[PDB]
Ligand binder design. Sequence first.
Ligand code: CL
Ligand code: CL
Ligand code: ZN
Lengths: 436, 423
Amino acid sequence: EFGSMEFVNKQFNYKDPVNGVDIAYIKIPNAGQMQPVKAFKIHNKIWVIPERDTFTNPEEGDLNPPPEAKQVPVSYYDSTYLSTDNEKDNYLKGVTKLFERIYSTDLGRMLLTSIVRGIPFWGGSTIDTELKVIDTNCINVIQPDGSYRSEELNLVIIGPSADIIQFECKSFGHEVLNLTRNGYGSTQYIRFSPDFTFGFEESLEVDTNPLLGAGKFATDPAVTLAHELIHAGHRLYGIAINPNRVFKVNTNAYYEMSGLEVSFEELRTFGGHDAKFIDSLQENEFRLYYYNKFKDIASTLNKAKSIVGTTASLQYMKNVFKEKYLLSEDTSGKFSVDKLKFDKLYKMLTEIYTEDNFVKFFKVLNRKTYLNFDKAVFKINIVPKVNYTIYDGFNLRNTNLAANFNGQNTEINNMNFTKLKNFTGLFEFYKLLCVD
Amino acid sequence: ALNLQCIKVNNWDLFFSPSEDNFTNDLNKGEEITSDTNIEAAEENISLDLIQQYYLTFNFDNEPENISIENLSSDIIGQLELMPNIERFPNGKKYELDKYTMFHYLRAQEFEHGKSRIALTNSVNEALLNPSRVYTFFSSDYVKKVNKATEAAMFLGWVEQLVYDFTDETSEVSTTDKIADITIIIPYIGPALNIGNMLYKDDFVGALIFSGAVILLEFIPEIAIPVLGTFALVSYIANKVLTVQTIDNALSKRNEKWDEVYKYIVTNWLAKVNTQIDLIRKKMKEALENQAEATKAIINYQYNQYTEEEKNNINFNIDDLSSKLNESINKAMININKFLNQCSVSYLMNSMIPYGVKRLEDFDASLKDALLKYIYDNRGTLIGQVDRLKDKVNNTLSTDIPFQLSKYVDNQRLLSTFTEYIK
Ligand SMILES: [Cl-]
Ligand SMILES: [Cl-]
Ligand SMILES: [Zn+2]
């Protein structure tokens, strides 16, 4: 139960009065005009919005099941979820606990630090001799008196949209620029819920744990969030792989999936074997590409003569980006990209921060491939320390749930998992195999 | 085909199978070695140790500050990143097969854990028809005993023997060294998923020994290694140092080449083969669980047929029963995973790697003649040490470079499988 007042040094209660600093109603980048939502600042550059996401996407306002299902293995709907103060308070505490758990690991500490330094580039000027922030990488913090002030941030955790267990990284872009793929980076919004988790089946620990439980095991919420934070990390450094690059599959044969399409960015993020499905020719293609993007940033910093929109000096801002991209500079102040340093930073964000390596640090049971599809959805409550801890997750030490990932076992630790109806029929998406 | 027996197979329970397009390489690409050829250093693998080194050279203090910026418009106008549009995948596609599939066999081992308490194990896939009849790859004797109506006075003994019978059926294992790289064989896998379409432990073990692991694959992966690109060498008349550097670069470059071919094959093996074995081990686990459930179903039904004698005379605890059968499933899986690990690595080593090694040997041969000719034609520039170099070249290009899986894979359970394989 330690490491509680560490990455998030605030004991927020959802109903606490607004103050305009770390507790305030805010407005985020939006198409039309959105009503202010109550948000919390849990750490430098990071906010949490305990609301269902019905504002980032205009085409996503209805919280009911879509006309067409959603070609996914598992899905869940409930327009009533996350609508009461209690629900929102518990959500705030859940997201916070997961952060502490992630932060309490060395890898987690590194990734969280990399995220905070991953400030979206100040590349919004049309005049190259000036550094200007890009407004979609900010939010407006409304003050108690009704006035407001703008603020930059790198990460926002919001409730899920209609499909409650569809977690993803969303960010706003520029009209001409591709912020997540050009090194600039952009503020990330993550749809996530610490109130539900997936069920998967193990086919392999045994050998090491002959007394492994029987049923399905629950994915540790911390792993799921860390997974999204890895995507967030890529996006903040403008190195996420283009969504168009996906692992095309054959589907004609009777035994083949009717469809799938897992992106390279996804294989990269999971790690393990998955990431090795990508040949070296293409991996080098990606690295060279982003290395050149980093050199562009370096040139842009050297072209800057003035900074607009802040009392912060041009020197400070250049140093901020020197540090983020780990650029080198001469005594003359010139900035450049060191191949070695670029390589380490690129390897760290791409190969060190992976779901699989996180499984290693957490030491929990987890799918060994992105291809081991979830088969169930459960309701959980990780806030009470008697159900889940920052140090052990579900597998509480000095408890009967301590060994063999018993805590993660649905049947054994049944008081912690309630199976919910999957909204994607067992036979919604399928192939008809017939024999004469 | 007038009449048909059909089953709906969930999309997510089907096989992966990457497109050959995802795999590219420029191995056939030639190259010219010079005294300035850039040599790629060895890419250290990711491990808890590397991560440790990264943690130390890490700055935690001083995060960028929350500097003040000038107010933006009260409404920040933005639009989310496009996000490619994926055409909905075709659904409900029908297929007419001339054989029962892995999916049929597996589906045949199911029943609704609802009220219908009259399930009966049996050895024919016609359990696919009757929802009260479950299929089993267990011996026919097992079906006879489990289906048999049992006296309340003989319930517990009956059960105890089924638990043992259950373990006997699933702990089954065969040994051999007539397959190379595959020492054990779980014969019931054949009749459990109808692997190779034979449904007879007997035929199964045979097929495996005959043609190897390929028997398990739902599709034979394709993997070709073109003729490797050759090296051209630049001589530097009267410039010993540059001439030598060229010879060392040509050599160090050959090592990268072997590494490149090895790594490429591992990527293909990993995506096309290993994935298929993984799904198979997941299905075996499903089959085993189906069996445990059916047996528990049958056993519990029997118990509910009694009359209050279930009180003292019995005092049955289905949880303990379930617990014991689960341990048997785990023991079984330990064997299955061992066998499948061997199949996987065996396929990599005997049906894939070989293709690259031959391509690499052709290459070494070429490079060798080349370099020895090189040294000769520059014996005047290298006057101080042609033998030293000749020996170096001969010693290096005469031995193939050892394929070491740990160099490309981290899954410890696959590495040991490789180590065991080495012996
Ligand atoms: Cl805790
Ligand atoms: Cl509770
Ligand atoms: Zn993902």
